[PDB]
Design a binder for this molecule. Sequence first.
Ligand SMILES: Fc1ccc(CSc2ncnc3[nH]cnc23)cc1Cl
Length: 167
Amino acid sequence: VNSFSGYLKLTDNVYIKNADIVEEAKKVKPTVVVNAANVYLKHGGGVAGALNKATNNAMQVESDDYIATNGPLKVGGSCVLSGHNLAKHCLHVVGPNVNKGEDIQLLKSAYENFNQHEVLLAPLLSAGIFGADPIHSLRVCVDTVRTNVYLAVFDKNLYDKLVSSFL
Ligand SMILES: Fc1ccc(CSc2ncnc3[nH]cnc23)cc1Cl
């Protein structure tokens, strides 16, 4: 039993809700919140900009030190950093950005990072400003993630479409 509330169950391990991931994280304080990161951990907009804003820019400060030490992530890769006031940990995961020309096949590799964590609150990778089809992202999530994932979808219209079209 966990504290996630109001989710629709899609499969044995995947759950979905129309919710603002920032507000959901602040309420649940999950062990892991997933950020829709880029390789530079520049949290300017989309989910990343919102999460970082909610940390009063502490996420960005921590991220800049991480990059100065380690260099950029790989597309499809991840790193674990602090969750600040939102969660114990933040798993920064880089899905391919279609608006940069990145290989959509890397979306499966990106979701594989979730399997290193027993339970996660997450957005749909590569959705939103990353330019991929969210219906496809949900399919890859369900077919790749084996751990327990609670998906927050900000847009109510998109949430309804994801549920109604789910096979
Ligand atoms: F400044 C802000 C502006 C917007 C929000 C809503 S969170 C959100 N944004 C974008 N895509 C998503 N996918 C799942 N949740 C989200 C929070 C803050 Cl703090």
